[PDB]
Design a protein around this ligand. Structure first.
Ligand SMILES: CCNC(=O)[C@H]1O[C@@H](n2cnc3c(NCC(c4ccccc4)c4ccccc4)nc(C(=O)NCCNC(=O)NC4CCN(c5ccccn5)CC4)nc32)[C@H](O)[C@@H]1O
Length: 441
């Protein structure tokens, strides 16, 4: 085993793997339209970046390890590309994470704030900013045996540490991690929230934090809390302040929406109790099943719920399974099956299972970010930690050599693992990949 021959061979194996693993991703999305959401637009960009490292950044990172003599700007150029090609991969990961953040926490505005048009504009940013940082030394932030105007072509020789540590590390690689981490937790915390009536109707009707026009052009906020039928947005905003009790500018917090929602629930219940046909059924239900009945009122109305004479009878007799089947035959179930299905299950079980199941999609995304952040940090932290010690403790006992180059190997391993791992974990790709493998191979 010659020391570095091993190192180069790994880098080349990564090149192939990086290329191959990434050639697949962009290919799948090409022929399957289910994978042509705005999100996979971000994916194809990352995949392409990770292809570019396999062809140019890898051979460059390798050729920066020989020490041949060449113009400082000609050897800096090479080190700058490998920097640039990697900056993009870092920022491209942000595009995916933040996209997954809004899709989970703010699903309504997703299509509004996240259009296929805008997305392509955000990638343009990620790529330009990558150039801005990687090519900073070429602007003048550099460090310039062999002859005049020729240095030993070595990374540290041409790239100072005050750039790698202060600017590159903290501003370009670290704040991703801290950001990408914040995404993981806040998504994670959303998938594991304690369930209740408020969250229940947030899933069926959707939560709104800014005033919006309902389906009939009446200003509404929260979960279907109408403000006024007046055609004046200023009038609607005024009414909001009356209920909130402060200056809102047309915007409220999540807690304020829950106080409006709670007031609305208290109102629906008082109406149910006035109904000679709904009060007997309402009293004979436990807390969770009462939330299911309130859900039907918030959708149809008391007189509309009262129409279910038979299904209301079985409920008071606690014939849960029998009431469910009868509710399945209603026009209400036929016009909105998804919501009615979750509501019926709540009647059957008296639990939040049907809605808890709705969050399985959330935890899938959470577990999928644990991996991206874990690998990303595992692959990037080592090499940069090494840079820091060299910069702050020159006289220290440097870490072992063979290990140093491994850290370099880890940084490049990110390009092949990170994009493919996200795709392969979301099965729609898996079926698409196998389809390609058998058909063309
Ligand atoms: C996120 C933005 N992008 C990147 O981070 C990408 O840029 C590359 N990179 C990023 N830091 C890199 C980096 N650190 C600095 C460098 C270093 C650190 C301390 C002291 C000297 C050099 C290092 C080299 C190897 C591994 C890790 C870091 N050295 C290289 C890069 O090729 N070195 C190879 C060419 N030099 C050398 O063998 N010198 C030798 C190293 C061993 N001896 C030592 C060691 C300790 C103390 C004294 N003498 C003598 C000089 N490449 C890097 C890499 O491709 C990353 O993915």
């Amino acid at each position: 085993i010659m020391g570095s021959s091993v190192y180069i061979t790994v880098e080349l194996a990564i090149a192939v793997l990086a290329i191959l693993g990434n050639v697949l991703v962009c290919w799948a999305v090409w022929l399957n339209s289910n994978l042509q959401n705005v999100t996979n637009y971000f994916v194809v960009s990352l995949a392409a970046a990770d292809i570019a490292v396999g062809v140019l950044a890898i051979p460059f990172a390798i050729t920066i390890s020989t020490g041949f003599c060449a113009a400082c700007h000609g050897c800096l150029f090479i080190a700058c590309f490998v920097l640039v090609l990697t900056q993009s991969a870092i920022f491209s990961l942000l595009a995916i994470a933040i996209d997954r953040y809004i899709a989970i926490r703010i699903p309504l505005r997703y299509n509004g704030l996240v259009t296929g048009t805008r997305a392509k504009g955000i990638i343009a940013i990620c790529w330009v900013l990558s150039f801005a940082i990687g090519l900073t030394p070429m602007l003048g932030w550099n460090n310039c045996g062999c002859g005049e105007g020729q240095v030993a072509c070595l990374f540290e020789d041409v790239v100072p540490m005050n750039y790698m540590v202060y600017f590159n590390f903290f501003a370009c690689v670290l704040v991703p991690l801290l950001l990408m981490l914040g995404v993981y937790l806040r998504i994670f915390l959303a998938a594991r929230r304690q369930l209740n009536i408020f969250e229940m109707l947030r899933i069926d009707e959707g939560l709104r934090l800014k005033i919006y026009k309902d389906t009939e052009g009446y200003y509404t906020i929260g979960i279907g809390h109408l403000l006024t039928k007046s055609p004046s947005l200023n009038a609607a905003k005024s009414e909001l302040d009356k209920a909130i009790g402060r200056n809102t500018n047309g915007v409220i917090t999540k807690d304020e929406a829950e106080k409006l929602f709670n007031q609305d629930v208290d109102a629906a219940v008082r109406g149910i109790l006035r109904n000679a046909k709904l009060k007997p059924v309402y009293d004979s239900l436990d807390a969770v099943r009462r939330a299911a009945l309130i859900n039907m009122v918030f959708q149809m109305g008391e007189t509309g719920v009262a129409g279910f004479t038979n299904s209301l009878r079985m409920l008071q007799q606690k014939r849960w399974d029998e009431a469910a089947v009868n509710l399945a035959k209603s026009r209400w179930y036929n016009q909105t099956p998804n919501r009615a299905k979750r509501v019926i299950t709540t009647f059957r079980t008296g639990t939040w299972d049907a809605y808890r199941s709705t969050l399985q999609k959330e935890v899938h995304a959470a577990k999928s970010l644990a991996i991206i952040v874990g690998l990303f940090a595992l692959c990037w932290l080592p090499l940069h930690i090494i840079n820091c010690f060299t910069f702050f403790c020159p006289d220290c006992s440097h870490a072992p050599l063979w290990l140093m180059y491994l850290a370099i190997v880890l940084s490049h391993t990110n390009s092949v693992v990170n994009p493919f791992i996200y795709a392969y974990r979301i099965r729609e790709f898996r079926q698409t990949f196998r389809k390609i493998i058998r058909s063309h191979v």
